[PDB]
PDB file of C-alpha atoms in Angstrom:
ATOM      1  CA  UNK V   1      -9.860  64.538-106.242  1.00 44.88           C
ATOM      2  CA  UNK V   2      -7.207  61.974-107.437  1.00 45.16           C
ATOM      3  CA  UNK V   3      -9.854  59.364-107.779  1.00 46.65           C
ATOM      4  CA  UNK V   4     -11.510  58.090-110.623  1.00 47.81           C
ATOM      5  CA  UNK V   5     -15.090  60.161-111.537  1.00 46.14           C
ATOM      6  CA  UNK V   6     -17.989  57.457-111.576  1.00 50.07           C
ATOM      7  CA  UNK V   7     -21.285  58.900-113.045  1.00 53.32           C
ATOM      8  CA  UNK V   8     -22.652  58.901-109.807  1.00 54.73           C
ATOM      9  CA  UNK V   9     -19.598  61.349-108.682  1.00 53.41           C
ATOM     10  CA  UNK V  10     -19.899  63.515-111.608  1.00 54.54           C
ATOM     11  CA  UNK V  11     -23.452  64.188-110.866  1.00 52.87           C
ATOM     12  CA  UNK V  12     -21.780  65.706-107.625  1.00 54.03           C
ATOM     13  CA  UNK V  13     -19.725  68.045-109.168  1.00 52.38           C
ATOM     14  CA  UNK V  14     -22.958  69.132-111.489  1.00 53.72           C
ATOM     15  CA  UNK V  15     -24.981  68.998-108.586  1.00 54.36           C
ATOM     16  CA  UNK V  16     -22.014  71.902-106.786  1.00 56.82           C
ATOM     17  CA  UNK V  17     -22.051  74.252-109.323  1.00 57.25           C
ATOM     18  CA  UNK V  18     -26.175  74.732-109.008  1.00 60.24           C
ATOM     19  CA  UNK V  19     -24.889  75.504-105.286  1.00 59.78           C
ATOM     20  CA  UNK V  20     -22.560  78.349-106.496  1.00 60.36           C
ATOM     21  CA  UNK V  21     -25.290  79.805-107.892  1.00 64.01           C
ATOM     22  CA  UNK V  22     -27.432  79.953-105.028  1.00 64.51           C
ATOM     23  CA  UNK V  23     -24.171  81.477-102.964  1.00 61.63           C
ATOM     24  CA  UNK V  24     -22.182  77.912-101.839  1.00 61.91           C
ATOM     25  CA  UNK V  25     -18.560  78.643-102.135  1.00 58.62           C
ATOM     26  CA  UNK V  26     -16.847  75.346-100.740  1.00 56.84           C
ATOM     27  CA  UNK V  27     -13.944  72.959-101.776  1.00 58.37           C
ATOM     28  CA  UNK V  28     -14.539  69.860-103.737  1.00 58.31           C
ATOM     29  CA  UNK V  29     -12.510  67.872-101.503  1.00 54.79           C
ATOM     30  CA  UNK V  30     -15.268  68.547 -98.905  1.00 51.03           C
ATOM     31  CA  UNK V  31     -18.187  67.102-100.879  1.00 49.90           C
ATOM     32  CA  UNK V  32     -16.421  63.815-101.122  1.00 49.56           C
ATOM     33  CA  UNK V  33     -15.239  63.961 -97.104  1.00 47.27           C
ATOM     34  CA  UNK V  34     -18.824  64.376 -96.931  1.00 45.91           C
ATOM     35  CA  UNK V  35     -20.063  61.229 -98.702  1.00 42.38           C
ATOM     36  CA  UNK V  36     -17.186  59.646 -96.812  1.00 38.04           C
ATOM     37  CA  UNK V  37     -18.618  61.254 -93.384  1.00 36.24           C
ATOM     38  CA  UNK V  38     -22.150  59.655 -94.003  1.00 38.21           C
ATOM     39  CA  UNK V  39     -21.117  56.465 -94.274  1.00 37.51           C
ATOM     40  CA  UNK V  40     -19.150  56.732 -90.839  1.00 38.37           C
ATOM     41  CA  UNK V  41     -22.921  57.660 -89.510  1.00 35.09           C
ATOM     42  CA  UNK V  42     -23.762  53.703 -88.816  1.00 34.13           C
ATOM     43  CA  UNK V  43     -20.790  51.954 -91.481  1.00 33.90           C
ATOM     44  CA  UNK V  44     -18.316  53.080 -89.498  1.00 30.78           C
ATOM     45  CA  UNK V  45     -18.550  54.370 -86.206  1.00 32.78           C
ATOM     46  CA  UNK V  46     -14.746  55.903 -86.269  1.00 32.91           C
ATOM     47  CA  UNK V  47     -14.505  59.155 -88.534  1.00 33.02           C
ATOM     48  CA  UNK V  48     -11.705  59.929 -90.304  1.00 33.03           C
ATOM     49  CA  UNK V  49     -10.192  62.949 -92.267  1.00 33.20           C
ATOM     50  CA  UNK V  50     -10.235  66.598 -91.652  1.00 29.62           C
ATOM     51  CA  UNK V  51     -13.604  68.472 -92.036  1.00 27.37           C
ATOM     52  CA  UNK V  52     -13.962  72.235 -93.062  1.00 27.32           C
ATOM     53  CA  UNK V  53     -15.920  74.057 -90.192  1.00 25.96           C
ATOM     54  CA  UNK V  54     -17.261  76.229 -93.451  1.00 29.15           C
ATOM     55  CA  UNK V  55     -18.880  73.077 -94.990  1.00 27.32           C
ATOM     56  CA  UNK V  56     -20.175  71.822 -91.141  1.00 26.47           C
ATOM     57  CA  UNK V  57     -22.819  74.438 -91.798  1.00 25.72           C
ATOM     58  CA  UNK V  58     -24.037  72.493 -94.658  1.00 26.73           C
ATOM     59  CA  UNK V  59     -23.833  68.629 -92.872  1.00 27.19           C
ATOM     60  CA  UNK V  60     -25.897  70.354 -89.603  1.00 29.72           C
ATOM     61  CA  UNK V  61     -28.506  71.365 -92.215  1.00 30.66           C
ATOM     62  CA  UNK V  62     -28.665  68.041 -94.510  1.00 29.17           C
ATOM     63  CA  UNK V  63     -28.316  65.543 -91.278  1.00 28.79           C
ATOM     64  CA  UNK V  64     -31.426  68.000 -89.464  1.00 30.41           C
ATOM     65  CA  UNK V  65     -33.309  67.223 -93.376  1.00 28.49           C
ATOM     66  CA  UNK V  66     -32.873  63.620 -92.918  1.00 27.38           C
ATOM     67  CA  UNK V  67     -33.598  63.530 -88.994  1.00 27.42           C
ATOM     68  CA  UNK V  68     -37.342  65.007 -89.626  1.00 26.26           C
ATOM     69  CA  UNK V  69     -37.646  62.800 -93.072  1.00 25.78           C
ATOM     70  CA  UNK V  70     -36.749  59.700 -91.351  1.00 28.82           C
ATOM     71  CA  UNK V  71     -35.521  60.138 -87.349  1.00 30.18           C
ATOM     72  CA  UNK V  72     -33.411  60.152 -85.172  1.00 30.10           C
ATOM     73  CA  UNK V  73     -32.655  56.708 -86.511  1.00 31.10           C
ATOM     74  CA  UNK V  74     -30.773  58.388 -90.066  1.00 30.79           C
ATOM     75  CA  UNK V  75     -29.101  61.356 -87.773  1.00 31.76           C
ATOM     76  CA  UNK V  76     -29.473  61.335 -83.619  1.00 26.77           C
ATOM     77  CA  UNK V  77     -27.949  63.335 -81.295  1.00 29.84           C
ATOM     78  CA  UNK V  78     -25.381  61.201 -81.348  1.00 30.83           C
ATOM     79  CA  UNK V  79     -24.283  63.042 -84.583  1.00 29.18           C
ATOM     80  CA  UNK V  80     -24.001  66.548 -82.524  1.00 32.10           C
ATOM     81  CA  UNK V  81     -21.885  64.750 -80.228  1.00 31.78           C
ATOM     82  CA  UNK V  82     -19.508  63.170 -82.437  1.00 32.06           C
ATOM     83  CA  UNK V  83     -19.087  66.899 -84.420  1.00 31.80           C
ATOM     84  CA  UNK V  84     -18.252  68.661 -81.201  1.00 32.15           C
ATOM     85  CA  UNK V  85     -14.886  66.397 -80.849  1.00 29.06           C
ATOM     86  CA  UNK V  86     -14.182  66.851 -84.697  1.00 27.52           C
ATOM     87  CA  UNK V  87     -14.540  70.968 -84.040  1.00 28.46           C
ATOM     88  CA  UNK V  88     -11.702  70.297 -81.338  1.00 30.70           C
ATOM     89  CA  UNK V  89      -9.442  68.548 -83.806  1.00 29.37           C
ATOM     90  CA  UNK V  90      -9.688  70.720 -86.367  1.00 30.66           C
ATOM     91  CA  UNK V  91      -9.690  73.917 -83.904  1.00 28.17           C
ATOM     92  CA  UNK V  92      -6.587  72.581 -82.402  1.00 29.72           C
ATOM     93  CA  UNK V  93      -4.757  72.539 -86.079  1.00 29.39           C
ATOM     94  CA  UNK V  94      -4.878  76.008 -87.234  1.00 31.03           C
ATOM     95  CA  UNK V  95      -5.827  75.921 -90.878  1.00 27.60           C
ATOM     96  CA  UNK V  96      -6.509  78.263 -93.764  1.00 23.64           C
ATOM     97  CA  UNK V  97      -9.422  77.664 -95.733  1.00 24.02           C
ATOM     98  CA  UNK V  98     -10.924  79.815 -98.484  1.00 24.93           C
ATOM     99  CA  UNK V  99     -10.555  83.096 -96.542  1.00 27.81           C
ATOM    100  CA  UNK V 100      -8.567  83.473 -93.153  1.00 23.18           C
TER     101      UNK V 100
END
């Protein structure tokens, strides 16, 4: 964290622990890389930070929700693209998530 909780953030962290229940087991530091990693969709064309290839399985889910609500427009194929570089930078720097 180390930023200050808006309401809109703290409905986040409500909105995680509903996820535990249904069997999500992720760090919060991802859900707010992953606000940060929408906004680099069209905002910001350049990404930036490290993501968690544990929590990619939830952003290939949530961006293929918002491709069939809106389009490609929200989420193309660009998206897919973009990840695949990101799963080299992160694959190159060995980390150690929640297990291994």
């Amino acid at each position: 964290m180390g930023q200050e909780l808006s309401q809109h953030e703290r409905y986040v962290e409500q909105l995680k622990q509903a996820l535990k229940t249904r069997g999500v087991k992720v760090k919060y530091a991802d859900l707010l890389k992953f606000f940060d990693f929408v906004k680099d969709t069209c905002p910001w064309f350049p990404q930036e930070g490290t993501i968690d290839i544990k929590f990619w399985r939830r952003v290939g889910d949530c961006f293929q929700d918002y491709y069939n609500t809106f389009g490609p427009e929200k989420v193309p194929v660009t998206a897919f693209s973009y990840w695949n570089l990101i799963k080299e930078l992160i694959d190159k720097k060995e980390v150690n998530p929640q297990v291994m």
